[PDB]
Structure formats: C-alpha cells, structure tokens
Design a protein around this ligand. Structure first.
Ligand SMILES: Cn1c(N)nc2c3cccnc3ccc21
Ligand SMILES: [Mg+2]
Ligand SMILES: [Zn+2]
Length: 313
C-alpha cells in the first residue's frame, strides 16, 4: 500500500500533458502505466501483484507489428489518463478503473491488418464476428487474460460492479472500430447542439466514452510534429503490407495502402485530418472543454502536413 511508483522529474511533469511521448525504453512502459493507474484511480484500485501480472500477460499478447503494438497500447492508455485527469469529477470510480484497462487491451493480438482484409481473406475471425471483427477479438482476448489464475485485477469488486466494469470495457473496445465512430460523433454533435446531451443518461455516457476511445486511439495525430511524423511511418508500414496482401488476393488496394503511391500520402493525411481527426477532437472539446489541447495539437499537425505538400519540408 505504501509503495508509490515515482518517475524521473522530466517524466513526472510531462506525463500530465496530452502530448507526452512514452519514450523508446520498453522496460519503463509498465511502470508508466502503473503510475497512471495509481494517480487516476488510487493505489487501492488494484492489488499491485495482480496488476503487474495482468500488464505482462497483456504485453505478451501484443505482436511485433510496426504500429498496432505494445507501445500503441500504452500511448492510448496515456491519452485516456490525460483526459481523465483534466476532467476529475465527471467519471465514476469504476469508469476510471475500466477505461485505462480498456485502452491497454483495445488492440490485443492485432496482426496489423484491417477488418476489410480479414473479410476479403476469409479469416476464421470474420466468420465468428461479422462486424467490428478485430475489436470483438480484442475484447475476447481481454476476458481470456483476466481469467488466467492470479490475473483477476477486478476480484475486490462485487458481482454487479464486476459486470458493469466488463460492460464499460466491452463498449469501450468495440468503439475503437472507426467504422462506428462517424455515426457516434454525428449523434453526439446533434445532442450537444440541440442541447439534449445529458451525462446522467447511461446511453449518452456510452457514446461520450466511445468518442474518448476514438480520441485516445488516434492521439498520434495530437503529438509534437516530429513524433506525429515518425509514427505516420509505422502506420503506413502496416497499410502498405496490407496493400501487398490485397494485391496477392488479386485486389488492387485503395491508394492509401499501395506502396507505389507514396507520393499521395501527404494528401491522404489531409483527408484523414479533415474527415476524421479535426471533427473527432472538435466534438470532444465541445463535450469536454479541458481536452482542447488535443484539438490545438491536431490542428498544428494539419498545418505541418499542408507544409509538406507546399514543398517547405
Ligand atoms: C486510414 N487511417 C486509419 N484507419 N487510421 C489512421 C491513423 C491513425 C492515427 C494516426 N494517423 C492515421 C492516419 C491514417 C489512418
Ligand atoms: Mg484497433
Ligand atoms: Zn488502436
């Protein structure tokens, strides 16, 4: 109980900021996550011995892919930590417990391929889960790891609290399916504007938690330019591999995923910032005012991408 994790001074200060980069030392990421849980939740939330065992199984079930990896898991959980810390009073005890675990687990056992490629490949997972294929797999993997012996970090919860937290986790992981984001943002938009957005309505909470999950999942677009730019390379290394695999099934891939069309990537980033990122953080800022720094950082990176096209870098 009296065993606080502390970070070196630069990390202690910068981890509070939305734009924090968890760094290149993998050995520090578990401790960074524990520190975030202890400050976001309490030193009481989780029995440390169980949490540390949970974290190491979770790490072991992420794959060595360019982007959808362990570092992404912890980066997404750090964004959730920043939102939750800048919106202290708005979230329940159980939500704070659940959402950092959801974010750490949201891409469990990802192979670096989209739901579309599983469907065209005819992967067993596409037969088992017709929509949000990889996301239902991520939640399935989460439940499996929680049910390993010595891994149930939720044991001190009641039967009802247990079901509520796993329901929070399930909706949260499903919501990272970007196919679901568009409808979810549109409905949050209409609720906020007409003024009917009511945070005591559990269905309205679900929607808001989903937008947060999208915001955290995309947060590589909200980092300082050199981080955002270098993460773009890992992101497109998975897209191009998926494009290669599409051509192998005799399907010309969308240009995004075609490694012959690398010249079209900067224009593709504009589309993505304009169509997905800018609206995502706009709507989130309107619902949760203290997350504005995500919108600001997102807008700055859009400006950096327009500069790449103009030729000035
Ligand atoms: C097509 N596309 C999808 N599905 N996710 C992303 C993305 C996610 C984080 C950062 N940059 C990104 C650029 C393009 C993306
Ligand atoms: Mg995912
Ligand atoms: Zn993700």
């Amino acid at each position: 109980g009296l065993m606080q994790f502390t970070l070196p001074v630069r990390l202690c200060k910068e981890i509070e900021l939305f734009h924090f980069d968890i760094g290149p030392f993998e050995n520090m990421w578990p401790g960074i996550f524990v520190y975030m849980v202890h400050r976001s939740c309490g030193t009481s939330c989780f029995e440390l011995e169980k949490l540390c065992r949970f974290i190491m199984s979770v790490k072991k079930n992420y794959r060595r892919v360019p982007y959808h990896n362990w570092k992404h898991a912890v980066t997404v959980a750090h964004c959730m930590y920043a939102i939750l810390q800048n919106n202290h009073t708005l979230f329940t005890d159980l939500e704070r417990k659940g959402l950092l675990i959801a974010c750490l687990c949201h891409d469990l056992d990802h192979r670096g391929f989209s739901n579309s490629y599983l469907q065209k490949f005819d992967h067993p997972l596409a037969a088992l889960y017709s929509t949000s294929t990889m996301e239902q797999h991520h939640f399935s993997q989460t439940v499996s790891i929680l049910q390993l012996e010595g891994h149930n970090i939720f044991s001190t919860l009641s039967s009802s609290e247990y079901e509520q937290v796993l329901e929070i986790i399930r909706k949260a992981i499903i919501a990272t399916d970007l196919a679901l984001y568009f409808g979810n943002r549109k409905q949050l938009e209409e609720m906020y504007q007409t003024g009917s957005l009511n945070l005591n309505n559990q269905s309205h909470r679900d929607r808001v938690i989903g937008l947060m999950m999208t915001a955290c999942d995309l947060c590589s677009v909200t980092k300082l330019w050199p981080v955002t730019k270098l993460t773009a390379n890992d992101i497109y290394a998975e897209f191009w591999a998926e494009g290669d695999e599409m051509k192998k099934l005799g399907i010309q891939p969308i240009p995004m995923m075609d490694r012959d069309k690398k010249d079209e990537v900067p224009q593709g980033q504009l589309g993505f910032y304009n169509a997905v990122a800018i609206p995502c953080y706009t709507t989130l800022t309107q619902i949760l005012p203290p997350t504005e720094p995500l919108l600001k950082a997102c807008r700055d990176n859009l400006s950096q991408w327009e500069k790449v096209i103009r030729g000035e870098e």
